[PDB]
Design an enzyme around this catalytic site. Structure first.
Site, PDB file in Angstrom:
ATOM      1  N   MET A  25       0.828  -1.207   0.000  1.00 23.97           N
ATOM      2  CA  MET A  25       0.000   0.000   0.000  1.00 23.97           C
ATOM      3  C   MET A  25       0.861   1.254   0.000  1.00 23.97           C
ATOM      4  O   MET A  25       0.432   2.317  -0.464  1.00 23.97           O
ATOM      5  CB  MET A  25      -0.891   0.039   1.239  1.00 23.97           C
ATOM      6  CG  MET A  25      -0.113   0.291   2.520  1.00 23.97           C
ATOM      7  SD  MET A  25      -1.148   0.389   3.974  1.00 23.97           S
ATOM      8  CE  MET A  25      -1.421  -1.335   4.190  1.00 23.97           C
ATOM      9  N   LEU A  80      -6.240   6.496  -1.131  1.00 22.99           N
ATOM     10  CA  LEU A  80      -6.784   5.397  -0.336  1.00 22.99           C
ATOM     11  C   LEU A  80      -8.313   5.392  -0.276  1.00 22.99           C
ATOM     12  O   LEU A  80      -8.950   4.356  -0.487  1.00 22.99           O
ATOM     13  CB  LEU A  80      -6.199   5.445   1.078  1.00 22.99           C
ATOM     14  CG  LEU A  80      -6.551   4.321   2.060  1.00 22.99           C
ATOM     15  CD1 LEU A  80      -5.395   4.124   3.039  1.00 22.99           C
ATOM     16  CD2 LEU A  80      -7.840   4.649   2.796  1.00 22.99           C
ATOM     17  N   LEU A  94     -10.822  -1.495  -2.170  1.00 23.78           N
ATOM     18  CA  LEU A  94     -10.673  -1.520  -0.727  1.00 23.78           C
ATOM     19  C   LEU A  94     -11.923  -0.998  -0.053  1.00 23.78           C
ATOM     20  O   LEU A  94     -12.325  -1.467   1.015  1.00 23.78           O
ATOM     21  CB  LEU A  94      -9.500  -0.628  -0.308  1.00 23.78           C
ATOM     22  CG  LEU A  94      -9.548  -0.077   1.128  1.00 23.78           C
ATOM     23  CD1 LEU A  94      -9.118  -1.163   2.110  1.00 23.78           C
ATOM     24  CD2 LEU A  94      -8.638   1.142   1.245  1.00 23.78           C
ATOM     25  N   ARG A 147       0.536   1.187  -3.669  1.00 24.41           N
ATOM     26  CA  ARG A 147      -0.831   1.479  -4.065  1.00 24.41           C
ATOM     27  C   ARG A 147      -1.252   2.936  -3.942  1.00 24.41           C
ATOM     28  O   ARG A 147      -1.927   3.463  -4.827  1.00 24.41           O
ATOM     29  CB  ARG A 147      -1.802   0.619  -3.243  1.00 24.41           C
ATOM     30  CG  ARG A 147      -3.195   0.476  -3.859  1.00 24.41           C
ATOM     31  CD  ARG A 147      -3.138  -0.384  -5.117  1.00 24.41           C
ATOM     32  NE  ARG A 147      -4.456  -0.677  -5.669  1.00 24.41           N
ATOM     33  CZ  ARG A 147      -5.168   0.165  -6.413  1.00 24.41           C
ATOM     34  NH1 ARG A 147      -4.692   1.371  -6.703  1.00 24.41           N
ATOM     35  NH2 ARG A 147      -6.360  -0.204  -6.870  1.00 24.41           N
ATOM     36  N   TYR A 148      -0.853   3.595  -2.858  1.00 20.66           N
ATOM     37  CA  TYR A 148      -1.288   4.966  -2.627  1.00 20.66           C
ATOM     38  C   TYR A 148      -0.227   6.064  -2.656  1.00 20.66           C
ATOM     39  O   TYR A 148      -0.534   7.222  -2.379  1.00 20.66           O
ATOM     40  CB  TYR A 148      -2.061   5.015  -1.302  1.00 20.66           C
ATOM     41  CG  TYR A 148      -3.096   3.910  -1.172  1.00 20.66           C
ATOM     42  CD1 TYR A 148      -3.127   3.083  -0.048  1.00 20.66           C
ATOM     43  CD2 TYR A 148      -4.019   3.664  -2.194  1.00 20.66           C
ATOM     44  CE1 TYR A 148      -4.047   2.028   0.056  1.00 20.66           C
ATOM     45  CE2 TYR A 148      -4.944   2.618  -2.103  1.00 20.66           C
ATOM     46  CZ  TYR A 148      -4.950   1.803  -0.977  1.00 20.66           C
ATOM     47  OH  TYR A 148      -5.842   0.756  -0.894  1.00 20.66           O
ATOM     48  N   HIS A 152      -3.850  -6.027  11.751  1.00 17.90           N
ATOM     49  CA  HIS A 152      -4.842  -5.007  11.426  1.00 17.90           C
ATOM     50  C   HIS A 152      -6.188  -5.703  11.252  1.00 17.90           C
ATOM     51  O   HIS A 152      -6.303  -6.678  10.512  1.00 17.90           O
ATOM     52  CB  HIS A 152      -4.488  -4.267  10.128  1.00 17.90           C
ATOM     53  CG  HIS A 152      -3.369  -3.280  10.274  1.00 17.90           C
ATOM     54  ND1 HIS A 152      -2.040  -3.639  10.203  1.00 17.90           N
ATOM     55  CD2 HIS A 152      -3.384  -1.945  10.507  1.00 17.90           C
ATOM     56  CE1 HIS A 152      -1.285  -2.571  10.386  1.00 17.90           C
ATOM     57  NE2 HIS A 152      -2.076  -1.530  10.574  1.00 17.90           N
ATOM     58  N   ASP A 205       7.314  -0.888   9.869  1.00 16.19           N
ATOM     59  CA  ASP A 205       6.843  -0.066  10.972  1.00 16.19           C
ATOM     60  C   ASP A 205       5.572   0.673  10.566  1.00 16.19           C
ATOM     61  O   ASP A 205       5.425   1.112   9.424  1.00 16.19           O
ATOM     62  CB  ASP A 205       7.913   0.943  11.400  1.00 16.19           C
ATOM     63  CG  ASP A 205       9.047   0.301  12.190  1.00 16.19           C
ATOM     64  OD1 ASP A 205       8.890  -0.851  12.663  1.00 16.19           O
ATOM     65  OD2 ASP A 205      10.094   0.966  12.350  1.00 16.19           O
ATOM     66  N   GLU A 220       1.372   2.760  15.972  1.00 14.69           N
ATOM     67  CA  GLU A 220       1.259   1.897  17.139  1.00 14.69           C
ATOM     68  C   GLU A 220      -0.086   2.060  17.818  1.00 14.69           C
ATOM     69  O   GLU A 220      -0.927   2.823  17.355  1.00 14.69           O
ATOM     70  CB  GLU A 220       2.389   2.197  18.121  1.00 14.69           C
ATOM     71  CG  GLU A 220       3.757   2.182  17.471  1.00 14.69           C
ATOM     72  CD  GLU A 220       4.878   2.191  18.485  1.00 14.69           C
ATOM     73  OE1 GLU A 220       4.838   3.032  19.409  1.00 14.69           O
ATOM     74  OE2 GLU A 220       5.800   1.357  18.354  1.00 14.69           O
ATOM     75  N   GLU A 260       0.697   2.501  23.616  1.00 14.32           N
ATOM     76  CA  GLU A 260       2.095   2.666  23.238  1.00 14.32           C
ATOM     77  C   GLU A 260       2.361   4.137  22.945  1.00 14.32           C
ATOM     78  O   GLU A 260       3.506   4.586  22.975  1.00 14.32           O
ATOM     79  CB  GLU A 260       2.430   1.839  21.990  1.00 14.32           C
ATOM     80  CG  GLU A 260       2.236   0.345  22.148  1.00 14.32           C
ATOM     81  CD  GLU A 260       2.633  -0.424  20.905  1.00 14.32           C
ATOM     82  OE1 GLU A 260       3.845  -0.551  20.640  1.00 14.32           O
ATOM     83  OE2 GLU A 260       1.731  -0.897  20.184  1.00 14.32           O
TER      84      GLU A 260
HETATM   85  C1  HEM Z   1     -11.045  -3.715   4.287  1.00 10.14           C
HETATM   86  C2  HEM Z   1     -10.737  -3.283   5.477  1.00 10.14           C
HETATM   87  C3  HEM Z   1      -9.847  -2.187   5.744  1.00 10.14           C
HETATM   88  C4  HEM Z   1     -10.265  -0.815   5.779  1.00 10.14           C
HETATM   89  C5  HEM Z   1     -11.631  -0.244   5.567  1.00 10.14           C
HETATM   90  C6  HEM Z   1      -9.039  -0.086   6.066  1.00 10.14           C
HETATM   91  C7  HEM Z   1      -8.959   1.305   6.190  1.00 10.14           C
HETATM   92  C8  HEM Z   1      -7.896   2.068   6.445  1.00 10.14           C
HETATM   93  C9  HEM Z   1      -7.856   3.504   6.564  1.00 10.14           C
HETATM   94  C10 HEM Z   1      -9.113   4.396   6.411  1.00 10.14           C
HETATM   95  C11 HEM Z   1      -6.590   3.895   6.819  1.00 10.14           C
HETATM   96  C12 HEM Z   1      -6.140   5.330   7.005  1.00 10.14           C
HETATM   97  C13 HEM Z   1      -6.047   5.669   8.486  1.00 10.14           C
HETATM   98  C14 HEM Z   1      -7.354   6.038   9.142  1.00 10.14           C
HETATM   99  O1  HEM Z   1      -8.137   6.850   8.562  1.00 10.14           O
HETATM  100  O2  HEM Z   1      -7.615   5.527  10.188  1.00 10.14           O
HETATM  101  C15 HEM Z   1      -5.838   2.710   6.862  1.00 10.14           C
HETATM  102  C16 HEM Z   1      -4.467   2.652   7.097  1.00 10.14           C
HETATM  103  C17 HEM Z   1      -3.698   1.515   7.147  1.00 10.14           C
HETATM  104  N1  HEM Z   1      -4.175   0.235   6.972  1.00 10.14           N
HETATM  105 FE1  HEM Z   1      -6.057  -0.328   6.596  1.00 10.14          FE
HETATM  106  N2  HEM Z   1      -7.961  -0.859   6.205  1.00 10.14           N
HETATM  107  C18 HEM Z   1      -8.455  -2.169   6.014  1.00 10.14           C
HETATM  108  C19 HEM Z   1      -7.659  -3.306   6.083  1.00 10.14           C
HETATM  109  C20 HEM Z   1      -6.308  -3.325   6.335  1.00 10.14           C
HETATM  110  C21 HEM Z   1      -5.536  -4.577   6.402  1.00 10.14           C
HETATM  111  C22 HEM Z   1      -6.100  -5.981   6.220  1.00 10.14           C
HETATM  112  C23 HEM Z   1      -4.202  -4.223   6.664  1.00 10.14           C
HETATM  113  C24 HEM Z   1      -3.136  -5.051   6.811  1.00 10.14           C
HETATM  114  C25 HEM Z   1      -2.042  -5.360   6.209  1.00 10.14           C
HETATM  115  C26 HEM Z   1      -4.255  -2.712   6.751  1.00 10.14           C
HETATM  116  C27 HEM Z   1      -3.172  -1.965   6.996  1.00 10.14           C
HETATM  117  C28 HEM Z   1      -3.130  -0.597   7.098  1.00 10.14           C
HETATM  118  C29 HEM Z   1      -1.866   0.147   7.367  1.00 10.14           C
HETATM  119  C30 HEM Z   1      -0.502  -0.521   7.553  1.00 10.14           C
HETATM  120  C31 HEM Z   1      -2.234   1.467   7.391  1.00 10.14           C
HETATM  121  C32 HEM Z   1      -1.285   2.620   7.616  1.00 10.14           C
HETATM  122  C33 HEM Z   1      -1.619   3.161   8.987  1.00 10.14           C
HETATM  123  C34 HEM Z   1      -1.327   2.348  10.131  1.00 10.14           C
HETATM  124  O3  HEM Z   1      -0.145   2.082  10.418  1.00 10.14           O
HETATM  125  O4  HEM Z   1      -2.293   1.963  10.847  1.00 10.14           O
HETATM  126  N3  HEM Z   1      -5.486  -2.234   6.562  1.00 10.14           N
HETATM  127  N4  HEM Z   1      -6.642   1.569   6.633  1.00 10.14           N
END
Ligand code: HEM
Ligand code: HEM
Ligand code: CHD
Ligand code: CHD
Ligand code: CHD
Ligand code: CHD
Ligand code: FES
Ligand code: FES
Lengths: 359, 359
Positions: B12, B28, B34, B100-101, B199, B276, B279, B283
């Protein structure tokens, strides 16, 4: 020369005949290790007499009752014969059936175990994957027993509280899946979707940290690994009861969904309950299945047989008890840790019960 | 000599600096693979504009941004090094970063791969466990590119769409866990709770049949297996964002629940994202830390380090690409099956894209 080591085979049990459905449900809705209800001692009797008809009807659909007792006894006998030869120093071994909701009740088994003056007692759960609602409840009943009577065990207790990835268990699943795949047309064998179907859990239980989902998922992976990923698969959850949210995908909606998307050959696998039990909507309801065919054109929906009496299963059971005895474990490391959001004070008492045992 | 085999590393991505947060969020919330929102092209920009501050604050709390680009390049370089020795026949190998983003975007990498005149491209997901929202979106992007560009691939494609139990991935996890266990007091090391934290997914995605939960659960079992179950554990889910229901237990709720129940030493493990990232509450928030420690007496809450730069990791990546090449597979068996309740028409197109590839 008198039994030395007893093996208590734990399971929920099941109604032997439609005539047993009521008391089966009664004890079930009364189990606070399984669920907590307001004025439960008053509501349980009500819910029982109420759903009895609906549940008797379901058992009739599968033969008129549950064969768990007979199957468990057969496997129990087979396990013993192997143990007596595998571990001469702990023999003679004797198996006891400890069902949670029907005779022989868990308490009745403990009572008989005490009277036989056994030296070692092994609480052996028949659920490979651990849930506080199944194995947990059965383990709590043991602690509840001694605490109920108000006295200490005259036997040395230990427990095999989970075995989600036991190599022989995985082999039995792989064997049954290959066997059932043989029943699909040769031209479609490659297209069969393997749908592992385990009983679902309420989301409230999943969210408090229940070990079950993760362990069932482990069993599934080990099975597919053994089968060398020969077919595509998914782990879905069945028999969801009520309006509250339960862990999905639901098995019924998944079968329909798959059919609407071109997957006409499906192999259902009982991945979390080793005995025959109530089947799903598309297997029992002629109306639902017929519609599914008229609209989606489903070709074959088969179910792998339960590990019921496969000799390789008794060998699985004996192998587990043997290794347990050789390891000197009192329980798995996982049992020393309660759910992050556990709200049942009995749970940890049960944990201490087993970890504190002599030897 | 010219690049013979290209390895496209999919992820991503992440904002390199706080200044990149907006377009990261913009791309995103615009992702149909997604997320599906009404008039998405209208709401996405707005949502991004509104969440930027909160997200910039979070990244600042972890150093000012995401190190994913740097880490992925280093691993990519190391992977190529090993590949030119391991697979002489497909050498020279070249890695491309497909985020991706953020730049370099998936489309930019493909476009460059085409110009390089590669003889073979490999869509290699950096997420070991498959989710249609992560690996699925990145793969769909490859299909969307060639489709929207109205042209056909000049290279033969194939994909490593998942690797939840790759033996070297498991070894890296166990090494990092043992390494971190060494930071806890020796007398309390056996008391440490290993909390695998992945996540979470919205319950709507879980129930549609997403592969993710079961695969993450498999990774967990393999890791604990290698660690010979030295400590008790639980798989919890973090960063659940929003009010809607997501798969629990939640990491924050579990940490607190655990502490309230006597577990004062906790080891957090980033089991589903190798770099990374943001958190958890306990934390970051100093106030929640104090409240928790004051009324629970928390002793140690540590996080195992991300597989960021471990050489054994680069070796894991190369081991995977190598086996993938020798196997001649075009994709895993699992990719040939869509979610039973899939409602994204592109998914099926992406699948056909890979299974129909020449050779
Ligand atoms: C389909 C379900 C999912 C949705 C709707 C979703 C949504 C989001 C959103 C909206 C953000 C931006 C931060 C925020 O606004 O809170 C984000 C960040 C992120 N997402 Fe997801 N996500 C999903 C599944 C996943 C999965 C399965 C992973 C695992 C690998 C993942 C990993 C991350 C990571 C690594 C970030 C960067 C921010 C962080 O470290 O938390 N997401 N996601
Ligand atoms: C906390 C979670 C669970 C709850 C609340 C629950 C509840 C129930 C209830 C109320 C029944 C009676 C059927 C009815 O009245 O419609 C039942 C039957 C049954 N349950 Fe559970 N259950 C749970 C977990 C499990 C698990 C994890 C297993 C897996 C081994 C399981 C296996 C069964 C079986 C085998 C029956 C007999 C029915 C059949 O053959 O399908 N249950 N459960
Ligand atoms: C109020 C209680 C939930 C309490 C809680 O979550 O804290 C819920 C859970 C079980 C429910 C009961 C069971 O569903 C059985 C009965 C179902 C009927 O439709 C209503 C009465 C009935 C007796 C329900 C009353 C009430 O809605 C109950 C008792
Ligand atoms: C399905 C059954 C009602 C059957 C009927 O009314 O005919 C209802 C009544 C009691 C309910 C249970 C009780 O309310 C206790 C638990 C409440 C939690 O919120 C969900 C799990 C939980 C274990 C419930 C599962 C399910 O909703 C039950 C078992
Ligand atoms: C209506 C739609 C769900 C449609 C569906 O499920 O079929 C939901 C999902 C995303 C929601 C939006 C997002 O949550 C972003 C905004 C959140 C605010 O609290 C309300 C407006 C806001 C713009 C929401 C409006 C509405 O509740 C949306 C658009
Ligand atoms: C987490 C974020 C709110 C963040 C905040 O308030 O600080 C909310 C607002 C818009 C929500 C999304 C939208 O409602 C669209 C989807 C709705 C589904 O029910 C869950 C996934 C889904 C993609 C939601 C994920 C999450 O709940 C979002 C992204
Ligand atoms: S409910 Fe799981 S340990 Fe108590
Ligand atoms: S959403 Fe999973 S295959 Fe389409």
């Amino acid at each position: 020369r008198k039994p030395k080591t007893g093996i208590l085979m734990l399971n929920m049990g099941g109604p032997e005949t439609l005539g047993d459905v009521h008391d089966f449900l009664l004890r079930l809705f009364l189990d606070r290790d399984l669920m907590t209800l307001p004025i439960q001692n008053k509501l349980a009797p009500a819910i029982a007499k109420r759903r009895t008809p609906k549940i008797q009807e379901q058992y009739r659909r599968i033969g008129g009752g549950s064969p768990i007792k007979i199957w468990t006894s057969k496997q129990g006998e087979g396990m013993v014969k192997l143990l007596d030869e595998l571990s001469p120093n702990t023999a003679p071994h004797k198996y006891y059936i400890g069902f949670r909701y029907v005779h022989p009740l868990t308490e009745e088994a403990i009572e008989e175990m005490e009277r036989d003056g056994l030296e070692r007692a092994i609480a052996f759960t028949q659920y490979p994957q651990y849930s506080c609602s199944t194995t947990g409840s059965s383990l709590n009943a043991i602690y509840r027993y001694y605490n109920q009577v108000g006295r200490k065990p005259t036997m040395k207790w230990s427990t095999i509280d989970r075995w989600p990835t036991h190599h022989l268990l995985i082999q039995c699943f792989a064997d049954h899946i290959l066997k059932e795949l043989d029943h699909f047309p040769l031209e479609k064998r490659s297209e069969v979707v393997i749908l592992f179907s385990a009983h679902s859990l309420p989301m409230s239980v999943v969210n408090r940290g229940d070990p079950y989902p993760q362990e069932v998922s482990a069993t599934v992976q080990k099975v597919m690994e053994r089968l060398e990923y020969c077919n595509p698969y998914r782990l879905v959850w069945q028999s969801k009861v009520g309006p509250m949210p339960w862990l999905g995908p639901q098995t019924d909606e998944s079968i329909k969904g798959l059919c609407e998307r071109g997957r006409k050959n499906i192999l259902l696998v009982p991945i979390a309950f080793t005995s025959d039990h109530i089947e799903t909507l598309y297997e029992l309801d002629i109306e639902y299945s017929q519609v599914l065919a008229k609209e989606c054109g489903v070709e074959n929906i088969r179910r792998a047989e339960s590990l019921n009496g496969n000799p390789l299963f008794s060998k699985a059971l004996a192998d587990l008890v043997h290794s347990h005895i050789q390891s000197n474990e009192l329980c798995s490391k996982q049992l020393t840790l309660s759910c992050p959001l556990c709200v049942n004070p009995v749970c940890r008492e049960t944990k201490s019960f087993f970890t504190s045992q002599q030897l």
